[PDB]
Amino acid sequence: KVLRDNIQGITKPAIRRLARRGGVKRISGLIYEETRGVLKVFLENVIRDAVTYTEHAKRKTVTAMDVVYALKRQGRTLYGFG
Template sequence: MLYFNVVLEVNALSLVAPLSNFRSTRQASCLGEATARTAVVKVARLSRRAGVIRISGLVYHETRAVLRVFMANPIRDAVTYTEHAHRKTVTGVDVLFAFKPQGRILYGFEL
């Protein structure tokens, strides 16, 4: 659960902007829009790698929701392995061990 707490703290800190600087205020207000744009680009890149040529605009929101559900358990397991080892950094081995119980073995990484 350490991962989710850190993300929430970072997001809360990035939304705070000084009132005297217009650029900082503008950047803080566009934070959600920028995140949505980058998510669209990342989903399109993943789709292109899978062989998809054209993507409907309605697919992006659904894809983000499916990826969030799919990655929730491995992320939680990887963070659990990290906390059990008394570390603050999630390693590749933690991720490999997190995917193994789900039957999704990742090849190309050394243990």
């Protein structure tokens, strides 16, 4: 089960929904994929670092506390998950 191309699984309607939440009126097309890239790049770090935790955790499943400590180490800490 080898996955691929779920990045475009991000719908442009979803992107513009997030933008409207951010309070944006007019948007260009060139953004979305660009956006996506950033998205990827962003998560590009955390999961790895997260599984890095799981790396040292010696476990096969990945937990929330992983990304908790990541975002912490990434200076983007989050609440509500222990």
